[PDB]
Amino acid sequence: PQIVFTATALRDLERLREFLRSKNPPAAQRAASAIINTIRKLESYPDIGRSFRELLIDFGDTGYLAMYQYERLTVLCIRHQK
């Protein structure tokens, strides 16, 4: 698949970034790796969750929630803070 993010998922990432600043000391680089892991594990075994499903991304303090769809480019829509 193509692993595509939506505009809503990009700006959920932006909120996210601009947050960590006042969040974990260096978990900015810790959250980033967790997503890229989640991004490239979607590039392979694309599945999990609950007709599209969800996916949790765990890192340090707590975790977030990726939501995505599908049949050749799992569009990634929305990643709120759970």
């Binding site: 193509q2 692993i3 595509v4 993010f5 939506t6 505009a7 809503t8 998922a9 990009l10 990432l13 932006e14 970034r17 960590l20 260096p26 900015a28 680089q29 959250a31 980033a32 790796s33 997503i35 890229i36 991004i39 490239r40 979607l42 590039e43 929630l65 939501m67 769809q69 569009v75 990634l76 829509c77 929305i78 709120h80």
Partner: protein, 88 residues
């Protein structure tokens, strides 16, 4: 109001728990539904804003690739960071 529910063995774990923390079994059960429906209404909200987010992507058609945000993310916290672009 006044409608009845029926559980199985779980009610025993309730009545036992409604005795450890010495609270009313009838009260406890109610807090359960409120917490539930509160959490669950917020899940129904994330659904639509997720569902909507899509509807917008299907109409607008613009997106960014995982690699671009993979490219963006690997510079997080390392002073010279990056932004995100918007391809069509």
């Amino acid at each position: 109001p006044v409608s009845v529910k029926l559980d199985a063995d779980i009610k025993a774990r309730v009545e036992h728990l409604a005795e450890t923390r010495k609270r009313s079994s009838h009260w406890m059960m109610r807090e359960a539904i409120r917490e539930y429906v509160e959490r669950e209404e917020k899940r129904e909200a994330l659904q639509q804003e997720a569902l909507r987010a899509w509807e917008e992507h299907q109409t607008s058609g613009l997106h960014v690739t995982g690699d671009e945000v993979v490219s963006w993310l690997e510079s997080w916290g390392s002073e010279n960071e990056q932004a995100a672009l918007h391809a069509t």
